[PDB]
């Protein structure tokens with residue numbers, strides 16, 4: 399079917415044309431996101447649509463100077479939002495890490511619905527997690543209140559490039575039957591060879607990155623917004 | 629198009645027939661999940677397919693006695709996995725909260741691709757966050773190693789019920805233009821009335837839950853597996 403064909407045809411698009419996305423298309427992309435499952439129907443995700451050209455420029459910089467953030471027809475910012483709940487009832491305790499996990503999982507689910515909806519319409523896109531490296535600055539720029547935090551952005555627009563589909567680790571490595579199975583390094587070597595043909599190896603790159611520090615300011619940032627304190 | 633139609637027709641299915649999911653369908657569902665975007669191409673998600681009936685029963689109880697966990701044709705458990713990286717390179721530091729956020733977000737993205745793929749085939753499903761009630765016990769049952777943790781499960785199978793689509797908060801409440809906008813309590817009251825018509829109110833129910841403690845054992849659990857320690 400068309401749904402599975404769209405899912406399997408995915409590839410991040412980082413170059414867009416100037417052709418805008420229609421109001422009908424955008425509204426449909428948003429409705430698709432809303433139709434996503436929500437943990438306990440809490441609906442803890444907020445989307446900040448950035449149309450202001452100056453804020454776009456600042457966000458492109460806060461993302462690590464990723465130009466496509468400014469050139470994209472649309473730029474959405476996904477945030478954890480327990481402020482809605484806090485406004486309704488001030489007795490809400492939103493500092494439990496469980497709630498941050500829910501915000502993160504539910505955001506990914508919603509964002510993927512938005513992306514797939516866009517892709518099925520012939521649009522291209524890419525997630526922007528780089529915003530987290532400048533979390534505090536991005537948070538202030540968008541005026542996020544207490545019990546709210548930024549997770550990632552998303553570029554949407556008409557493609558101006560046609561990249562090849564990137565191969566993933568094989569299903570037998572990712573999927574485990576009944577119990578977690580030990581990793582067979584021979585599978586990793588085969589994957590590295592596969593990735594080399596596509597393009598330092600994959601395994602060397604990803605593990606080298608994790609060998610150092612991974613944005614140590616993240617927990618302090620979440621805590622400053624009153625999240626993940628216990 | 630068909631993709632958008634499938635997305636908008638979503639409703640959680642909690643009643644399944646005894647008809648199993650074919651190998652071809654399951655493989656396609658997994659392939660759809662693998663086609664999802666990955667943060668820095670880290671591929672930090674692992675899926676544990678539970679075919680053991682004795683384990684299914686225990687998981688059903690651990691999930692809060694949710695019967696459909698046992699009756700579902702397929703039950704997939706999504707986990708954060710940095711053990712693959714740790715096996716390749718022992719110098720990997722996987723305790724940074726940033727890495728747990730990446731795991732949670734990426735899991736949601738992958739899982740949604742799996743669900744949509746299934747739903748497009750005429751199948752039904754429901755996320756199972758209830759596994760977190762007994763996270764530590766579910767972890768030991770599945771034999772998850774260090775740098776790995778359980779997030780949620782997913783029931784899949786042929787539907788034996790036809791629930792009506794649940795309405796979400798209006799787009800103007802969830803979507804903010806350029807900056808975070810203050811909540812208009814009138815919109816929440818309107819939504820409550822909409823939910824009452826579908827069926828205490830929604831706002832009263834969700835905030836009442838958040839007024840209590842939300843799975844306080846979660847952070848300690850993550851820490852016990854070497855995650856979210858700093």
Ligand SMILES: NC(=O)c1ccc[n+]([C@@H]2O[C@H](COP(=O)([O-])OP(=O)(O)OC[C@H]3O[C@@H](n4cnc5c(N)ncnc54)[C@H](O)[C@@H]3O)[C@@H](O)[C@H]2O)c1
Nearest residue numbers: 436437438439642691692693694695756757758759760761
């Ligand atoms: N009737 C109740 O008091 C009650 C309470 C909680 C959830 N629910 C129902 O469970 C599902 C909600 O899942 P969630 O997104 O909140 O996830 P979740 O992760 O909170 O899992 C459901 C939790 O609610 C408990 N529960 C109590 N009655 C339940 C019931 N009749 N069916 C299933 N679980 C029940 C379970 O033990 C479990 O801890 C919905 O179908 C909802 O209608 C009902």
Ligand SMILES: Cc1cc2nc3c(=O)[nH]c(=O)nc-3n(C[C@@H](O)[C@H](O)[C@@H](O)COP(=O)(O)O)c2cc1C
Nearest residue numbers: 408409410525526527528550564665666667668669
């Ligand atoms: C939550 C998340 C954040 C991401 N952040 C970035 C980012 O900041 N910039 C970028 O160019 N790509 C980012 N990516 C996307 C890609 O790196 C991408 O998914 C890729 O490595 C796999 O290729 P494909 O998406 O083309 O299949 C992100 C992916 C996810 C899931």
Ligand SMILES: Cc1cc2nc3c(=O)[nH]c(=O)nc-3n(C[C@@H](O)[C@H](O)[C@@H](O)COP(=O)(O)O)c2cc1C
Nearest residue numbers: 435436437438439638639640755756757758780794
């Ligand atoms: C990550 C996640 C976990 C969830 N956990 C459960 C669960 O344990 N049990 C259940 O019956 N429903 C669960 N739900 C699904 C429903 O609560 C559901 O999304 C619902 O409240 C909204 O209705 P719909 O999905 O039918 O549109 C979960 C949803 C998500 C996103």
